[PDB]
Amino acid sequence: IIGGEFTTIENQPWFAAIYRRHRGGSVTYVCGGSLMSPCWVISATHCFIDYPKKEDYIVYLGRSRLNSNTQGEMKFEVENLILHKDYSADTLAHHNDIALLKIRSKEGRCAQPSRTIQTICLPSMYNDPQFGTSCEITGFGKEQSTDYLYPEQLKMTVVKLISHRECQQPHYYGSEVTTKMLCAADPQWKTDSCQGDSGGPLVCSLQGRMTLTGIVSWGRGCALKDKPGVYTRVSHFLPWIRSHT
Numbered sequence: 152i153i154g155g156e157f158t159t160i161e162n163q164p165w166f167a168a169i170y171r172r173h174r175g176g177s178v179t180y181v182c183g184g185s186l187m188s189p190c191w192v193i194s195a196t197h198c199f200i201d202y203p204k205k206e207d208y209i210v211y212l213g214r215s216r217l218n219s220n221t222q223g224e225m226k227f228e229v230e231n232l233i234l235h236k237d238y239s240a241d242t243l244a245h246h247n248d249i250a251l252l253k254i255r256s257k258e259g260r261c262a263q264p265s266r267t268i269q270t271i272c273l274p275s276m277y278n279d280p281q282f283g284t285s286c287e288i289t290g291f292g293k294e295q296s297t298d299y300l301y302p303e304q305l306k307m308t309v310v311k312l313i314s315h316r317e318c319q320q321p322h323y324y325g326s327e328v329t330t331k332m333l334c335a336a337d338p339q340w341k342t343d344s345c346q347g348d349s350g351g352p353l354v355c356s357l358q359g360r361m362t363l364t365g366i367v368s369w370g371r372g373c374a375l376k377d378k379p380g381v382y383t384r385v386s387h388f389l390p391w392i393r394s395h396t
């Protein structure tokens with residue numbers, strides 16, 4: 152997250168932190184995700200398609216820092232990794248960029264809700280927020296595109312939704328962005344999501360309800376002028392999410 156503010160897991164309790172174990176035993180951060188139900192985390196298929204072995208992933212809920220054990224956190228393995236069968240990647244755009252991770256503790260349990268671990272609600276069909284709505288993102292991604300290290304402390308920022316018509320303008324993304332994707336960005340281009348934030352939530356308050364409106368997917372650069380962050384539109388995928396859970 153470029154710009155924005157430092158925060159802690161009690162203010163984003165649906166956020167999941169997903170790491171990968173390498174041969175040799177080092178572990179490194181991969182992507183964010185969101186808790187949708189005690190045993191199901193939803194993220195982005197591009198985060199996993201090149202390393203599709205479910206046994207390699209570690210998922211934490213309740214965790215506020217990259218490298219330390221936050222009180223109250225919970226650690227998990229992945230019982231079932233489900234990637235979308237029509238996922239694909241062009242030069243910029245990613246398609247059907249959505250995945251499901253069924254989670255279990257070493258005793259075989261799903262997440263236990265608490266003050267620092269909670270679900271986020273899914274959207275309803277054909278009801279997303281209007282353009283111009285402010286929504287939040289969260290993640291452990293890069294603070295600047297030239298950094299190679301990720302921030303030790305969890306970050307968040309707020310961005311505004313952009314219409315399909317504006318996002319398809321030729322200096323934005325043209326016909327590369329489709330009606331299954333949603334654009335969002337800062338009007339002054341000073342804060343944004345970035346590499347390391349993929350898979351994480353775009354949460355919008357709609358009609359009084361905090362809602363998982365999008366999943367961090369792709370973008371040209373980070374915080375660049377006329378280059379919005381682009382997000383999977385979760386409401387289109389409601390029949391796929393129910394059928395696979």
Ligand SMILES: N=C(N)c1ccc2cc(C(=O)Nc3ccccc3)ccc2c1
Binds near residue numbers: 347367374379381
């Ligand atoms: N400008 C953004 N909001 C944005 C969003 C997601 C991003 C993801 C990657 C990324 O590296 N994606 C990726 C990694 C591995 C395989 C495929 C894509 C890079 C820049 C981003 C910018």
